[PDB]
Design a protein around this ligand. Structure first.
Ligand SMILES: Nc1nc2c(ncn2[C@@H]2O[C@H](COP(=O)(O)OP(=O)(O)O)[C@@H](OP(=O)(O)OP(=O)(O)O)[C@H]2O)c(=O)[nH]1
Ligand SMILES: [Mg+2]
Ligand SMILES: [Zn+2]
Ligand SMILES: [Zn+2]
Lengths: 69, 1159
DNA sequence: TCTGACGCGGC
DNA sequence: GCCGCGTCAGA
């Protein structure tokens, strides 16, 4: 991706990458890969970047997720 | 915490070696000849090192799961995994202690300094040439006395017993053991207390430091001589068999076998009570064998095998380019990598690349297996491999799904800059030829002449996402070194646009009016109108102001048909003015930069892809061709040649009479030939560039449409000099010396040349080809040295908070400004506020300069400003974000965790190869080498005079001699003429001798700022003349590493004038700064060192050892027992740990934030 | 080739 | 206090 859309919410281009990696790992550990949705849709790591671009997930909320796991 | 955060190096005691060794080797036997099995006490013996097979005894009697840790009584071999053999170590007992080769030949040898005696005398004692008295006795002979054998006999007869004079290693070890550090240090300091170090005392300084280091370590001094030597594990030195029924044997094994047998022979001789001379010979041979084993050839000719190649020492393996530190630690050959030929791949996107199907299948074969198992097509790994082998049709679709969103890395053999490695998304394509986007090629600096690229695939989720975020081709648009975009069209794409943009005075459809771009396109499709024809088009669209206000632009503007066609490609918010021009290659780059600065990177990438598509389509329609007729010879060339020949004949007639000197005649002939050649070249340009046609109403000159002129004018390819040679003349040809040959070539390539003329031209081309190949190594070596000096530098804090910076003014060369002050200060924050002559402050301090802000300085005409710099940065071992200011690659303030030093080192190195004369001067400036007879600077301010013996030791009265009577002068040569008057008021640090400036003198006398300004002016002046563009900040960052060492004038708690690190001085000053009171913490003066000298002076031993001189660094570190925290990017890479920069710092900061929420 | 550094031997 | 000879170490 251009990462330019993701940069508006996130700053430095490094915190965004770390947050995306953590979100992707959490999604993979969530059992999301039933194998009926992976073929029809893009990989989880891109999905985390898409969620950051929407801004629905919220960078602050993602840090709260780590404590839960 | 289960993690080792520190690494330390210390000397090894004999007890420690015994603890390390699992077994003792008495006989040198490697393997049974009849059967390839371990010898009972051989170096490959299974009992000490371990079992060859996992959980199997050598006899094989114990081969069951019931016994795993059991040890067979029949054989010494234990039951365990064979991997233990690699980590298992062994020791060899020595009958006579052997002095370590490294310490004795340290150069400076540690043993010689400790004994305070010459190295040659110690070597003579070791060889048994001389006798040294171990015990002083009541006899007058000193303990440190060398006695000749007849002298030794006489001393024994006169005094008999009461004194000992042993010889060889044992005597040296005894002398080391019987030494009192406390007694020696106090007496040595007392000699230091009476300080007379003009000559004799300077040597004594090293001994005190060495004694103090030994006392702090607590390591025994006698440990340097080794009583026992450990044996390296067999796996590190394998004797595995190979095809042809032969076994490869390591060089170390032969040395070990020789040493063991020599030791056995020595023990047998001692047991037999054989003659002393034979025993001495055996002892000397054993010592030589030990020296050869540690490092052969250090003090003697190296021993060689039947091949005659010198054997490889253990020290040799760890050092050198083929050495373990740089060969395997940084070589790290990796799997999942592919090398293939590169194709133009024009249809591909800027972020898309073409990958062969077979290579993709091999690289993603494990991923394909996982998908097949998930699919249920194959229930077993073996079944999946068998189906993959047959290339089943279903496999290709699965591979396409797996690689649909997976990034790949493309790299080239010469990675001069980070831009060379980039990440693209692979799309399966037929053929074995890799396809890459044409625009990305310029950054790669590679061409489709058979060049080969290597592709790497990231397995980790973080790595694959991280590469896409920062390693993607779209992410990199501007050069890291300079703001100018690297994605601009290079060759044909520019030419087609230039051809379409051109206008024709008379064309069909001229004066036609088109309401919209679609109407003009329909007219072109009809083809009734001419593309070069002039038409009026009404255009209404939004425009973005510098302030960012958007205004509507409407009206009727006359435009060429081609410009109207190009109008559709331009995005909204961009004025039609940029398209309304000849659209030369320089114009295209400016348009791309304007789009990126305001529109953004994504809009710029889309515009570049549209321009690339348009240029290829239009260029083919143009069908431009190159022909012999296209090049035109000048009509008046023959007359000019005849006139030049007549002038040469007149000069020859003058010389024959003897009226003119030969040298003057030669110079005149060369000048005449050069002038004639220049005139011929000037004439050729006008005819090709200018075409005269009889248009209606008369005949007028119009710009030529010749293909060669368009290519030269377009600037896509070629240059004026090539056009001059093809339609002009070779003229003067430089010989290997470079002096112009008096005869010149009037021949041209189109007309061809005579055999003699071709032979004269051959030398220059050959010399240039020889120069190009040799220069490649120097540029790489210089870049490596720069990377070593600035490798650890990084940004850790947003603001240092220092208000100290540097003064910036336009660098006028005295003939032109050359560099505008605004361009020099662009992207740089201001250290202090700027006050106008009117007295109204214009800019506040700590404000980053901007292009909009830059206009005010020229408008206010302020020629001088003060801006922050890395040298002025107050952070310890770090760079604040503010001091760097604009990153200059993303048009934003530099983000934290970015390695400025590595980029700065690489950017200076890459441009050097293109420039020839040149690289050596830059290298001398970086090394801070001082020019010979540079000049003389006098610190005291006083009247300058001469008259002190007139013996080449002329001195002047630097002291005033009026208020106080004193003489402050030093001897100087009378050979050079004086630069000072007989009577004058001499100033401190004023030049007294004409000549090159000395870099060391400026820092101590002119201060840091003057030296920094001089270095920047010299480096920029050298780079700009060649036309290479380098940011000033990149040069300054390397300079900051150059000054980390200062001399401490006052040692409140520290040492004296001995060089110390600035970081150590500041922390020590801080510790005593408020620890009790003031305590006179320190007084220091900055010093200048060479980049290599600075890198070797680095605190971390591992970083210094890897760069070079590994043996010397290791020998110094072991005695000091230095404990080193990695504290570096390089240290982490060796341990395979995340570097403290970029993503790694961010992960740590996020982890620190996570801890608080749970806390 | 060379550069220098470091030497360290003559006086 | 120094000339002038030398080692090493990288290219
Ligand atoms: N030809 C061309 N296309 C570009 C260029 N820049 C962007 N695109 C297209 O725009 C789409 C933008 O992809 P994203 O990464 O999701 O958006 P972003 O660029 O804003 O991050 C891409 O779609 P995609 O998922 O890659 O495939 P598609 O949707 O284009 O088929 C890409 O094809 C360019 O310079 N040239
Ligand atoms: Mg090539
Ligand atoms: Zn056994
Ligand atoms: Zn700073």
């Amino acid at each position: 991706v251009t990462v330019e859309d993701c940069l508006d919410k996130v700053e430095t281009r490094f915190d965004l990458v770390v947050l995306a990696s953590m979100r992707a790992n959490k999604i993979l550990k969530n059992g999301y890969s039933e194998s009926m949705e992976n073929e029809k849709k893009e990989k989880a790591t891109v999905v985390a970047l898409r969620e950051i671009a929407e801004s629905e997930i919220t960078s602050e909320q993602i840090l709260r997720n780590e404590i839960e796991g | 915490s289960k993690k080792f955060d520190i690494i330390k190096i210390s000397l090894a005691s004999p007890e420690v070696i015994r603890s390390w060794s699992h077994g003792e080797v008495k006989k040198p036997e490697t393997i049974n000849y009849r059967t390839f099995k371990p010898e009972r006490d051989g170096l490959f013996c299974a009992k000490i090192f371990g079992p060859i097979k996992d959980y199997e005894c050598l006899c094989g009697k114990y081969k069951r799961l019931k016994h795993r840790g059991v040890v067979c009584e029949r054989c010494g071999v234990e039951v365990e995994q064979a991997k233990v053999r690699r980590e298992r170590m062994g020791h060899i007992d020595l009958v006579c202690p052997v002095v370590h080769i490294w310490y004795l030949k340290s150069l400076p040898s540690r043993i010689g300094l400790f004994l305070d005696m010459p190295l040659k005398n110690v070597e003579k004692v070791l060889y048994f040439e001389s006798y040294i008295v171990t015990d002083p006795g009541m006899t007058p002979l000193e303990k440190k006395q060398l006695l000749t054998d007849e002298e030794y006999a006489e001393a024994l007869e006169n005094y008999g017993y009461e004194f000992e004079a042993s010889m060889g290693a044992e005597a040296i070890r005894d002398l080391l053991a019987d030494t009192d550090i406390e007694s020696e240090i106090e007496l040595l300091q007392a000699e230091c207390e009476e300080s007379k170090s003009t000559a004799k005392k300077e040597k004594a300084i090293k001994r005190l430091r060495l004694l103090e280091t030994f006392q702090a370590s607590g390591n025994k001094p006698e440990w340097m001589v080794m009583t026992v030597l450990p044996v390296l594990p067999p796996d590190l030195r394998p004797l595995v068999p190979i095809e042809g029924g032969r076994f490869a044997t390591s060089d170390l094994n032969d040395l070990y076998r020789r040493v063991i047998n020599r030791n056995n022979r020595l023990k047998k001789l001692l047991d037999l009570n054989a003659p002393d001379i034979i025993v001495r010979n055996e002892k000397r041979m054993l010592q030589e064998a030990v020296d050869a084993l540690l490092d052969n050839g250090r003090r003697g000719r190296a021993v060689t095998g039947s091949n005659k190649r010198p054997l490889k020492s253990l020290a040799d393996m760890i050092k050198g380019k083929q050495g373990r530190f740089r060969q395997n630690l940084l070589g790290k050959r990796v799997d999942y990598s592919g090398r293939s030929v590169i194709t133009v791949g024009p249809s591909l996107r800027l972020h898309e690349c073409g990958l062969p199907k077979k290579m993709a299948l091999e690289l993603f074969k494990p991923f394909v297996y996982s998908k097949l198992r998930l699919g249920g097509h194959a229930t077993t790994i073996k079944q999946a491999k068998r189906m993959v082998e047959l290339e089943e049709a279903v496999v290709w679709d699965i591979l396409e799904t797996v690689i649909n969103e997976h990034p790949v890395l493309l790299n080239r053999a010469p990675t001069l800059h980070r831009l060379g490695i980039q990440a693209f998304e692979p799309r399966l394509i037929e053929g074995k030829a890799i396809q890459l986007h044409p625009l990305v090629c310029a950054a790669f600096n590679a061409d489709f002449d058979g060049d080969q690229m290597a592709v790497h695939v990231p397995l980790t989720v973080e790595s694959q996402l991280e590469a896409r975020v920062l390693m993607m081709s779209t992410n990199n648009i501007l050069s890291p070194a300079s703001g100018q975009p690297i994605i601009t069209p290079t060759q044909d794409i520019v030419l087609g646009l230039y051809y379409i943009t051109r206008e024709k005075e008379g064309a069909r459809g001229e004066g036609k009016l088109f309401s919209s771009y679609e109407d003009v396109s329909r007219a072109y499709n009809s083809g009734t109108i001419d593309i070069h024809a002039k038409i009026k088009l009404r255009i209404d669209r939004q425009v973005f102001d510098t302030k960012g206000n958007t205004y509507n632009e409407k009206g009727v503007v006359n435009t060429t048909v081609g410009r109207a066609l190009l109008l559709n490609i331009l995005p909204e918010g961009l004025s039609f003015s940029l398209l309304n021009k000849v659209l030369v290659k320089k114009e295209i780059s400016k348009i791309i930069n304007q789009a990126f600065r305001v529109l953004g990177g994504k809009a710029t990438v889309v515009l570049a892809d549209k321009l690339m598509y348009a240029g290829f389509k239009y260029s083919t329609l143009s069908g431009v061709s190159v022909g012999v007729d296209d090049m035109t010879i000048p009509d008046n060339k023959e007359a000019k040649i005849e006139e030049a020949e007549k002038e040469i004949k007149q000069i020859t007639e003058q010389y024959q009479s003897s009226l003119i000197t030969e040298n003057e005649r030669y110079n005149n002939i060369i000048n005449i030939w050069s002038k004639t050649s220049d005139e011929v070249g000037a004439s050729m340009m006008d005819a090709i560039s200018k075409d005269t046609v009889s248009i209606n109403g008369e005949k007028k000159e119009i710009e030529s449409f010749n293909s060669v002129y368009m290519m030269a004018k377009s600037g896509a390819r070629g240059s004026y000099n090539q056009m001059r040679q093809l339609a002009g003349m070779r003229g003067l040809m430089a010989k290997p010396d470079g002096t112009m040959i008096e005869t010149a070539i009037t021949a041209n390539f189109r007309e061809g040349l005579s055999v003699l003329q071709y032979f004269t031209s051959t030398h220059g081309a050959r010399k240039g080809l020889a120069d190009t190949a040799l220069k490649t190594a120097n540029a790489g070596y210089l870049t490596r040295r720069l990377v070593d000096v600035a490798q650890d530098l990084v940004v850790i804090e947003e603001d240092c908070g220092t208000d100290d910076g540097l003064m910036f003014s336009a660098i006028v060369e005295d003939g032109e400004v050359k560099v505008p002050l605004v361009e020099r200060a662009l992207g740089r924050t201001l250290a202090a506020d700027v006050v106008t002559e009117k007295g109204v402050v214009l800019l506040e301090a700590g404000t980053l300069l901007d292009e909009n802000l830059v206009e005010l300085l020229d408008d206010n005409g302020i020629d001088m400003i003060k801006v922050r710099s890395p040298i002025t940065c107050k952070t310890r071992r770090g760079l604040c974000a503010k001091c760097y200011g604009r990153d200059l690659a993303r048009e934003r303030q530099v983000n934290v965790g970015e390695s400025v030093g590595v980029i700065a080192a690489q950017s200076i190195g890459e441009p050097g190869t293109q420039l020839t004369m040149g690289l050596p001067r830059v290298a001398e400036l970086f090394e801070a080498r001082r020019p010979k007879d540079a000049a003389i600077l006098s610190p005291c301010d006083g009247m300058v005079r001469l008259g002190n013996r007139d013996t080449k030791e002329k001195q002047r009265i630097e002291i005033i001699d009026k208020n106080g009577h004193i003489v402050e002068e030093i001897l100087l040569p009378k050979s050079r003429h004086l630069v000072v008057f007989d009577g004058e008021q001499v100033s401190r640090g004023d030049v007294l001798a004409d000549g090159p400036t000395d870099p060391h003198d400026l820092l101590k006398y002119k201060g840091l700022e003057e030296f920094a300004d001089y270095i920047l002016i010299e480096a920029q002046s050298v780079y700009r003349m060649q036309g290479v563009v380098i940011n000033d900040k990149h040069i300054e960052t390397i300079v900051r590493q150059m000054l980390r060492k200062a001399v401490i004038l006052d040692e409140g708690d520290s040492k004296f004038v001995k060089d110390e690190s600035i970081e150590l001085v500041r922390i020590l000053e801080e510790n005593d700064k408020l620890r009790k009171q003031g305590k006179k913490e320190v007084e220091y003066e900055l010093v200048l060192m060479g980049i290599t000298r600075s890198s070797l002076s680095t605190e971390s031993f591992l970083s210094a050892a890897s760069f070079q001189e590994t043996t010397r660094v290791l020998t110094e570190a072991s005695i000091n027992s230095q404990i080193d925290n990695l504290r570096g990017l390089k240290e982490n890479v060796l341990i395979g740990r995340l570097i403290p920069a970029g993503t790694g710092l961010a992960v740590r900061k996020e982890s620190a934030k996570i801890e608080k929420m749970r806390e």
